[PDB]
């Protein structure tokens, strides 16, 4: 009966193989091989934010694109000011293994997380002058491997007990807990829209979830192993995928599967961050052969190099403003770059 | 040329960077310590030890110097994604169970858990305070059970000391090296401070060669 | 938040004095501090500064050497020693506490205050000094600079306050655009270098006072002599 069930579960499987071979007719090099290329792409350490004393793992920017947020594993969350290297506030933090941090896109609240299992919510604006805990998000037993704001009461997390989650900051509850990874989970990316979004695991599976319904929506394979990284593309019908095949590889939520390949021979290391840029035309990721590269988002084509760092490049972000590209790195330097 | 509110931001960064200097300070002068291990394996022992829900801080100082222990043990995942939170550690505390070599292949799966860490790209400087627990209940159950179920091409005494140097030759020898760090072995008493005296012992021997090597004599 | 100054009374000329400011429910040491005079019965004039940490301390002209302005962080309070007083020293002396970092909103609270009685700036133009108001009705209060207000970085440095009859100024709108926080949103400030125009739409009961405009280019901070609505 059971196995019965296990036979009908590899035919659904197969159907869905058939149908998405089904669909594929052409591949992304045989449309966009007449596009000129975008030729060499050089950019310059334009600021270098030298404040944290031990390795960074995560930074986010202001909606404003000026404003970035950056946490380290010294206990210290530092608030800069990206055209000025001020560090408008640093806040103490309670547990000093931090895997994430986030900024809400009013700009109000900050998160955090890490092995503590808890994604406290600082409150930025308040009247007696200084940053003080909002919210401890606890119930959720494993790291936090990102957290994301959709308004100023929504936030989504990511685990270590292979499930995602949906809070209520004001009631402390989580509302929707999202099931059904077999590894543990280990990026997240809002949808520009907030309807849905993508998480990646240790399954080297990509899933495209949806807010408020709750269910997972499409299941997305074709890494070897682990993926740590997803961003969307910027019409939120795409995203880009980082994982320790030193492959990034976009994948379609219309069409339901992979479409473009990114590796090259002469690495082999594993990626730690993507995102993309403004108009989406480059990706951006950050290896851990302590350099990103620059990847043409449409010809397959390494575009540049940004050789500042000295250690594994753990987190980068890209500027709504689409200006400025920040990367950090477990030397403690976050670099802006332009 | 900064205004009259660029220079009040300017000396609120200067005076935060201050804040953060000194925290460093504070903070670099402080030895943290890892705790590995399997469950039921004398981990709540050596901490009931030192100070008499994820991770799991036990903050305690010695000789007017702050020592830090990280039970790690309570939250589980894979340990691939974050043990690299690690490095810099100055010594790892892993602990082992004498009496579950037969109990269902604890040793075994201990000795690859020691292994996993042991030769881990990150922990490669960082040298291993190894503890053997529970040697009371180790000689009994090798007074009445046999020893080739933990290990199969063994044969000696079933002794106390024989058979408990050959489980310490066992694992002394996972370490593929040798000339980077260096294995402290001990076995626990019933309950006395020669167990806090010898973890304080390895982590003087600890700090006196990484002094050494960054002095440039070693 | 309560800002509560100690210290007045009357005072023969020429003799000392010290103010005391005691601050309550902030975080004390991360603000700078301001004093700020009101003569008994014209407009508000600046007096001194401290930055946080102390590091950092500007004068007015009129009492640099003087007066000389001290905090203790440890007990919250606000210190001001006056020696050699004059007959300008008369005034009310008010405590506000400012915080400068990208965004902030200094001059947001203001103390209570204290009334002591002794028997090459920017200057800033008021266009009115007395102007009738209609409840319901939209008015417009203008303010004018001697200097260029917009530095080179984009932000032109042009606070608004208002005072009601017997209470401490407040803030309305910071860096000549941005309502403070608490501020309902009938009040509206624009302009541009040096020319400068505050918004009132629908102006209701209890929002009748003084105005004030105030540079904070450089120092000294010059204020405006003070637009007054009556109905």
């Known amino acids: 009966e059971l196995d019965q069930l296990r036979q009908e579960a590899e035919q659904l499987k197969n159907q869905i193989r058939d149908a998405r071979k089904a669909c594929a007719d052409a591949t992304l090099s045989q449309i966009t091989n007449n596009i000129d290329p975008v030729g060499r792409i050089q950019m310059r350490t334009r600021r270098t934010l030298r404040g944290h004393l031990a390795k960074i793992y995560a930074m986010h920017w202001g909606t404003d694109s000026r404003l970035l947020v950056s946490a380290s594993q010294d206990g210290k969350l530092i608030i800069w000011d990206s055209y000025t290297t001020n560090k408008v506030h640093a806040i103490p933090l309670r547990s000093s293994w931090v895997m994430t941090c986030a900024y809400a896109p009013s700009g109000n609240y900050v998160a955090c997380g890490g092995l503590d299992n808890i994604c406290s919510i600082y409150n930025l604006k308040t009247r007696e002058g200084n940053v003080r805990v909002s919210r401890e998000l606890a119930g959720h037993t494993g790291y936090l491997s990102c957290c994301r704001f959709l308004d100023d009461n929504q936030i989504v997390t990511s685990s270590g007990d292979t499930t995602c989650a949906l809070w209520d900051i004001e009631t402390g509850q989580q509302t929707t807990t999202f099931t059904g990874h077999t590894g543990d989970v280990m990026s997240l990316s809002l949808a520009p829209d907030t309807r849905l979004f993508v998480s990646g695991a240790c399954d080297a599976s990509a899933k495209l979830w949806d807010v408020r319904e709750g269910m997972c929506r499409q299941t997305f394979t074709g890494h070897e192993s682990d993926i740590n990284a997803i961003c969307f593309f910027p019409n939120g019908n795409a995203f880009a995928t980082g994982s320790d095949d030193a492959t990034c590889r976009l994948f379609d939520l219309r069409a339901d599967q992979e479409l473009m390949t990114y590796s090259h021979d002469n690495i082999i290391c594993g990626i730690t961050s993507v995102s993309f840029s403004k108009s989406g035309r480059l990706l951006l990721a950050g290896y851990d052969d302590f350099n990103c590269n620059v990847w043409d988002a449409l010809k397959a084509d390494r575009a540049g190099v940004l050789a500042g760092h000295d250690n594994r490049v753990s987190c980068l972000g890209v500027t709504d403003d689409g200006m400025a590209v920040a990367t950090g790195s477990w030397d403690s330097f976050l670099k802006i770059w332009n | 040329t900064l205004s009259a509110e660029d220079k009040a931001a300017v000396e609120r960064s200067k005076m935060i960077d201050r804040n953060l200097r000194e925290d460093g300070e504070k903070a670099a002068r402080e030895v943290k310590l890892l705790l590995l291990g399997a469950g039921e394996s004398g981990k709540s022992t050596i901490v009931k030890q030192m100070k008499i829900t994820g991770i799991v801080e036990t903050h305690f100082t010695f000789k007017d110097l702050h020592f830090k222990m990280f039970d790690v043990g309570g939250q589980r995942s894979e340990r691939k994604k974050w043990i690299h939170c690690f490095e810099g550690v100055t010594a790892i505390i892993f602990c082992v169970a004498l009496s579950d070599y037969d109990l269902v292949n604890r040793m075994h799966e201990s000795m690859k858990l020691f292994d996993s860490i042991c030769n881990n790209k990150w922990f490669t400087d960082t040298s291993i305070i190894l503890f053997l627990n529970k040697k009371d209940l180790f000689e009994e159950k090798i007074k009445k059970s046999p020893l080739t179920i933990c290990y199969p091409e063994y044969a000696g005494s079933n002794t106390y000391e024989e058979a408990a140097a050959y489980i310490q030759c066992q694992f002394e020898d996972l370490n593929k090296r040798k000339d980077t760090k260096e294995i402290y072995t001990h076995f626990t008493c019933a309950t006395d401070t020669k167990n806090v005296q010898f973890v304080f012992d390895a982590v003087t021997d600890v700090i006196i060669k990484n002094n050494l090597k960054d002095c440039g004599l070693f | 938040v309560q800002l509560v100054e100690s210290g007045g009374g009357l005072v023969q000329p020429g003799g000392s004095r010290k103010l005391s400011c005691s601050a309550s429910?902030?975080?004390?040491?991360?603000?700078?501090m301001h004093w700020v005079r009101q003569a008994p019965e014209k407009g508000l004039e600046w007096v001194a500064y401290?930055?946080?940490?102390?590091?950092?301390?500007y004068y007015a002209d009129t009492v640099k050497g003087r007066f000389t302005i001290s905090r203790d962080d440890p007990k919250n309070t606000l210190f001001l020693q006056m020696t050699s007083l004059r007959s300008e020293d008369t005034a009310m002396y008010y405590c506000?506490?400012?915080?400068?970092?990208?965004?902030?909103?200094?001059?947001?609270?203001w103390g209570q205050g204290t009334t002591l009685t002794v028997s090459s700036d920017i200057v800033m133009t008021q266009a009115t000094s007395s102007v009738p108001v209609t409840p319901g009705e939209s008015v417009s209060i203008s303010c004018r600079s001697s200097?260029?207000?917009?530095?080179?970085?984009?932000?032109?440095?042009l606070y608004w306050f208002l005072q009601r009859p017997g209470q401490s100024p407040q803030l309305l709108i910071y860096?000549?655009?941005n309502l403070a926080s608490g501020v309902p949103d009938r009040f509206s400030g624009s302009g541009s270098g040096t020319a400068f125009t505050l918004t009132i739409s629908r102006l209701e009961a209890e929002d009748v006072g003084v105005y004030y405009c105030?540079?904070?280019?450089?120092?000294?901070?010059?204020f405006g002599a003070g637009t007054k609505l009556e109905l």
């Open positions: 506000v506490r400012s915080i400068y970092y990208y965004g902030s909103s200094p001059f947001d609270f």
């Open positions: 429910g902030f975080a004390f040491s991360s603000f700078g």
């Open positions: 401290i930055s946080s940490g102390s590091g950092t301390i």
């Open positions: 200097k260029s207000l917009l530095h080179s970085n984009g932000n032109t440095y």
């Open positions: 860096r000549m655009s």
């Open positions: 105030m540079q904070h280019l450089e120092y000294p901070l010059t």
